[PDB]
């Protein structure tokens, strides 16, 4: 009785939302961007090959200085690389080798990692003794740590396989906010540029926009057919892109509350593990399971180029804050820098 | 260029430490321990988050990882074990009602694109419980697997001494149910090694060592171009 009524109310609400989205879908992004010239053939080349990881790389995050990057590989090592010179600045031995995510703090003083240990471990890169030690372990997730991003040196938001995201206070080690509503494993999170919102892509084929302070899900973005492994905010913060296992990338607009573009090709049948925009957002780079990265014209849904230099699964993808380069980490235990 | 030289020297020191750790890591055999709650997977070798079991056979160090603290949805975190030497799949062979669930899980592991190169060491656990279930006669496998009625014991089967033929037919039928999935796809890249075990068996570590030795031989053969 009550359950059936609630389900029927939910179905009517979903129909209302779908009708509203159709109402604001006066035109398509293809029609709006039909007159602007195509970007051509984007031919990025491998400038640096970061070697030293001896197992598959699961994640990488650029530092905000756009020179230092931290890479997480399942050899039990977090390597902080000086990408300009390929010098390894730090090699952090991890307590749990099954790391699935890493984050580089915007200050650059901290890195975080996590995975099957269900713990976000914060590592201080600026210790007085000059050695990297565990500054804080953030236990409390009942599932694997799939993504983590620092908001600052004191706050980090983490997405997990327990179908929830969590905002952590690093100083006290307590969850200041818990973000619930996903019915699948939350695979990725992307912070908005103002860090007041974040989008999370989960294994429920839906992307959810969350208010960081209010703590509830503002918007749910559906349209993907399979698990969303990757999520990335558009640089203006008013849109975001999703990478999923259905072999499609999709661009959703926050204010329009619907999918604006689908990035797919018939010969692509492999899932997307990682997505990142360029600085202007005109290029949507996506890492794939076919060992390649496809550069998508975000406004024309055309594959602008292919980053074909990896012998195994491209697990992670990162564009620098200044937009000079793309770092592509893969399961072949190598990170390549491209531009 | 003095601080640049210091950075290069620190990077080379880090490279040396990484090379030493990787040489140490390459000697350790990483194993994924999988199974249901009733499978008895925790007592196979008998030695929060992901639980690691370390055991050594003939100077070879094995790291068996029991992934606790995760939800029942495994399609994402099981991708982390793409590079393990073997997956130890433990099956409660006496629980007929959950044998199909174990078979579906084995089929998903076998045919997963990130797990199709990993050989599976199949431990058909609780053989004593299976034997007493078959001798009791209360529970019939044909009620859960109708093809058991048309099943005959293979000529290559090696029954234990003093083992009832119905028990042998049952255990080898469950083994062949898993091996039909194993031989249905991925021929050559990975192999399934079945073992009939009870809870009191103390040779499972040796069984894992022999199967992992076979796996490493085949991987080395693929590396050599001989296979």
């Amino acid at each position: 009785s009550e359950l059936d009524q609630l389900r029927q109310e939910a179905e009517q609400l979903k129909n209302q939302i779908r009708d509203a989205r159709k109402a604001c879908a006066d035109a398509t992004l293809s029609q709006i961007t039909n007159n602007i010239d195509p970007v051509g053939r984007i031919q990025m080349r491998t400038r640096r090959t970061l070697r030293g990881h001896l197992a598959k790389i699961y994640a990488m995050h650029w530092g905000t200085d756009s020179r230092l990057l931290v890479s997480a590989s399942q050899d039990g090592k977090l390597i902080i690389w000086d990408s300009y010179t390929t010098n390894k600045v730090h090699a952090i031995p991890l307590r749990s080798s099954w790391v699935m995510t890493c984050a580089y703090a915007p200050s650059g003083n901290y890195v975080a990692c996590g995975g099957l240990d269900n713990i976000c471990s914060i590592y201080n890169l600026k210790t007085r003794e000059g050695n990297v030690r565990v500054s804080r372990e953030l236990a409390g997730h009942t599932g694997y740590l799939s993504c983590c991003r620092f908001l600052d040196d004191n706050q980090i938001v983490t997405s997990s396989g327990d179908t929830t995201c969590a905002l952590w206070d690093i100083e006290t080690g307590q969850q200041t906010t818990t973000f619930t509503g996903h019915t699948g494993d939350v695979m990725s999170l992307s912070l908005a540029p103002d860090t007041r919102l974040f989008v999370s892509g989960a294994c429920d084929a839906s992307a959810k926009l969350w208010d960081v302070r209010e703590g509830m899900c503002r918007q749910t973005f559906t349209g993907h057919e399979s698990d969303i492994n990757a999520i990335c905010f558009f640089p203006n913060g008013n849109a975001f892109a999703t990478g999923s296992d259905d072999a499609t990338c999709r661009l959703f607009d926050l204010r329009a509350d619907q999918e604006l573009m689908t990035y797919s090709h018939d010969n692509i049948i492999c899932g997307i593990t990682s997505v990142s925009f360029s600085k202007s957002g005109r290029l949507l780079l996506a890492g794939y399971d076919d060992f390649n990265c496809n550069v998508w014209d975000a406004l024309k849904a055309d594959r602008a180029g292919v980053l074909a230099g990896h012998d195994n699964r491209v697990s992670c993808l990162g564009v620098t804050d200044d937009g000079m380069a793309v770092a592509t980490g893969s399961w072949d235990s190598f990170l390549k820098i491209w531009n | 260029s003095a601080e640049d030289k210091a950075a290069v020297e620190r990077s080379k020191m880090i490279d040396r430490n990484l090379r030493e750790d990787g040489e140490k890591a390459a000697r350790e055999v990483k194993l994924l321990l999988l199974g249901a709650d009733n499978s008895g997977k925790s007592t196979i070798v008998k030695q929060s988050g992901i639980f690691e079991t370390k055991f050594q056979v003939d100077k070879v160090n094995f790291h068996m990882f029991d992934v606790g603290g995760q939800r029942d949805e495994r399609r994402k975190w099981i991708q982390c074990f793409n590079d393990v030497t073997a997956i130890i799949f433990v099956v409660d062979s006496s629980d007929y009602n959950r044998l199909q669930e174990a078979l579906n899980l084995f089929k998903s592991i076998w045919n997963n694109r990130w797990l199709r190169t990993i050989s599976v060491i199949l431990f058909l656990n609780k053989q004593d419980l299976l034997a007493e279930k078959v001798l009791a006669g209360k529970s019939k496998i044909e009620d859960y697997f109708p093809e058991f009625a048309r099943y005959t014991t293979p000529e290559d089967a090696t029954p234990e001494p003093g083992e009832d033929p119905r028990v042998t037919r049952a255990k080898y039928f469950i083994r062949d149910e898993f091996l039909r999935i194993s031989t249905a796809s991925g021929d050559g890249r990975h192999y399934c090694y079945p073992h009939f075990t009870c809870a009191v068996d103390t040779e499972n570590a040796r069984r894992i060592f022999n199967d992992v030795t076979d796996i490493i031989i085949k991987m080395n053969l693929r590396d050599c171009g001989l296979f």
Epitope: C203, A205, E225 | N112
Partner: nanobody
């Protein structure tokens, strides 16, 4: 939005017949292997049957072999379970479960508790 809406369930006499239909929307139906799973009262989620993307590879759990017939209409985006010779042990909520990823032989997690690509289910009661 990936939607699975199952229908056709109801109260049936033992030995009776029932045709379960699932209307699938929000995804390319022909790209996914499709599943039927059961939720018996007091038991866990049990996989019943599966059909391949083309519809050629069909497998059933042994308790329903010869009695259940899975079929898919990829043109109509509908999954069918023709349930003949129904027994009281077949009484369960029947869920249509999509495999999580397209073009995959493996089908993980369709019997998990909070699996996303599974419908709300249709109650099938087989009693006199």
């Amino acid at each position: 939005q990936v939607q699975l809406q199952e229908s056709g369930g109801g109260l049936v006499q033992p030995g009776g017949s029932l045709r379960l239909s699932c209307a699938a929307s929000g995804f390319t139906f022909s790209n996914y292997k499709m599943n039927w799973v059961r939720q018996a009262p007091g038991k866990g989620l049990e996989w019943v049957s599966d059909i391949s993307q083309s519809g050629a590879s069909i497998s059933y759990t042994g308790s329903v072999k010869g009695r259940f017939t899975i079929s898919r209409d990829n043109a109509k985006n509908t999954l069918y379970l023709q349930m003949n010779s129904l027994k009281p042990e077949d009484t369960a909520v029947y869920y249509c479960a999509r495999c999580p990823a397209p073009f995959t032989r493996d089908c993980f997690d369709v019997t998990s508790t909070t699996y996303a690509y599974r419908g709300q289910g249709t109650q099938v009661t087989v009693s006199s």
